[PDB]
Amino acid sequence: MSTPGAQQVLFRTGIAAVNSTNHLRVYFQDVYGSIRESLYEGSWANGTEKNVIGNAKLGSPVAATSKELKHIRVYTLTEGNTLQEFAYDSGTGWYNGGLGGAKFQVAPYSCIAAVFLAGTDALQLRIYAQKPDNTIQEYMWNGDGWKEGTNLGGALPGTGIGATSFRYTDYNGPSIRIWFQTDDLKLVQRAYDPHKGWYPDLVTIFDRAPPRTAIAATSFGAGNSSIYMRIYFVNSDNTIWQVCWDHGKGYHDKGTITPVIQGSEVAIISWGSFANNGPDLRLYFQNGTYISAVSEWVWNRAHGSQLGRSALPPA
């Protein structure tokens, strides 16, 4: 009922994913603590011992962001509970990124979210993690080196963190949205727009979620003061739930998506738009396929919601 390859995947591994349209990369932790990359270039590949991009503390969070597949950054925790980065650039390959040298100390139970800021060719990064005082701290890279950005206040110790960046087509700079769990177990959004900065208000997206539930988010289809967003978390029913932001409706359409193992982590990628025979969504999680394999859920225009690849490489 398992496979040799499935047995190599850590149960409740952190999961992250990046893409350029339907060209996909998925990152996960093996049972030895190595971070591996599985890939989709027309078919699923890799995820083996030969596809290791670095090592992290066992049980580390795993976050990733990209500029198409030209630049990829993967964030995890060291054994010393400092932030670290595995970097890929086209023409260079993989290397140990400069974030680790800053030795930013976070809570041992911190999660991580990461985004490249949208709508610029410049490489601008925002990383979100939880300090020992349980506050959410932004870390920035704007070409001058890593610096602390805005502190976004208290959250539940060990909260999941989701993040997305998009640029409205009528705006002169990028927007950011992040989601986390507060000390009262609610799920909330914080928001950055270039005229308002960080909005003061925490917007509740779900009234009560399991403590330290996984949180993952995406955005797509930016237009003139318009955006679409999807947030995923693991609910008390041992399923992933989806919360939708749709332009002109706001937050609505909250409901279950797919069952998962107790304590599954979650990753989401998206591409395209309602306007051009999209969008496409791909969700990654553990649902007990081959016990410990990572599985995929798909949304597309052709067939809507359905389970995708049942067991990613190496399973």
Ligand X SMILES: C[C@@H]1O[C@@H](SCc2ccc(OCc3cn(CCOCCOCCOCCO)nn3)cc2)[C@@H](O)[C@H](O)[C@@H]1O
Give, as one character, the DSSP assignment of residue 8: G
Distance CA 61, CA 76 (A): 6
Nearest approach, Cβ of residue 176 and ligand X (Å): 6
Nearest alpha carbon to residue 255 among 267, 268, 244, 270: 244
Q: Is-contact 218 281, C-beta < 8 A?
A: yes
> Residue 131's binding partner, choosing from Na ion, ligand X, none, with beta-carbon cut-off 5 to 8 A by kind?
none
Q: Which residues bind ligand X (CB under 6 A)?
A: 20, 23, 25, 37, 39, 41, 68-69, 72-73, 85, 87-89, 97-99, 123, 125-126, 138, 140-142, 149-150, 176, 192
Annotated binding residues for Zn(2+)? 244, 246, 252
Q: Give the number of residues written for the chain.
A: 315
Q: What are phi and psi of 267, to 5 degrees?
A: -135, 150
> Residue 48's binding partner, choosing from Na ion, ligand X, none, with beta-carbon cut-off 5 to 8 A by kind?
none
Judge residue 207's burial from the number of C-beta atoms within 10 Å of its C-beta, 0-12 exposed, 13-18 middle, 19 or more buried. exposed
Give, as one character, the DSSP assignment of residue 292: T
Nearer to ligand X, 114 or 257 (CB): 114
In the numeric block, which tokens belong to residue 203? 């917007």
Nearer to ligand X, 40 or 290 (CB): 40
Distance CA 299, CA 305 (A): 5
Among 5, 59, 157, 308, binds Na ion (CB under 5 A): 59
DSSP for 99-110 reads HHHH--B--TT-
Alpha carbons within 13 angstroms on the beta-carbon side of residue 127 total 30
Distance CA 94, CA 286 (A): 27
Distance CA 227, CA 153 (A): 25
Label each residue of 24-86 as H, E or C: EEEEEEECCCEEEEEEECCCEEECCHHHEEEECCCCCCCEEEEECCCEEEEEEECCCCEEEEE
Nearest approach, Cβ of residue 48 and Na ion (Å): 22
> Residue 6's binding partner, choosing from Na ion, ligand X, none, with beta-carbon cut-off 5 to 8 A by kind?
none
> Residue 59's binding partner, choosing from ligand X, Na ion, none, with beta-carbon cut-off 5 to 8 A by kind?
Na ion
Annotated binding residues? 25, 37, 44, 73, 85, 94, 98, 126, 138, 146, 150, 177, 189, 198, 230, 242, 244, 246, 252, 282, 296
Nearest approach, Cβ of residue 126 and ligand X (Å): 5
If one asks whether residue 158 binds Na ion (CB under 5 A), the answer comes out as no
Nearest approach, Cβ of residue 141 and ligand X (Å): 5
Nearest approach, Cβ of residue 297 and ligand X (Å): 22
> Residue 89's binding partner, choosing from Na ion, ligand X, none, with beta-carbon cut-off 5 to 8 A by kind?
ligand X
Nearest approach, Cβ of residue 155 and ligand X (Å): 16
Nearest alpha carbon to residue 3 among 296, 295, 283, 308: 295
- The residue sitting closest to Na ion, measured at its beta carbon, is 59
Distance CA 287, CA 182 (A): 26
> Residue 98's binding partner, choosing from Na ion, ligand X, none, with beta-carbon cut-off 5 to 8 A by kind?
ligand X
Nearer to ligand X, 88 or 220 (CB): 88
If one asks whether residue 263 binds Na ion (CB under 5 A), the answer comes out as no
Looking at this protein, which amino acid is placed at residue 132? P
> Residue 296's binding partner, choosing from Na ion, ligand X, none, with beta-carbon cut-off 5 to 8 A by kind?
none
Nearest approach, Cβ of residue 73 and ligand X (Å): 5
Residue burial 267-280, b: 16+ Cβ < 10 Å; e: rest = bbbbbbeeeeebbb
Nearer to ligand X, 87 or 222 (CB): 87
Nearer to ligand X, 84 or 239 (CB): 84
For Na ion, the binding residues (CB under 5 A) are 59
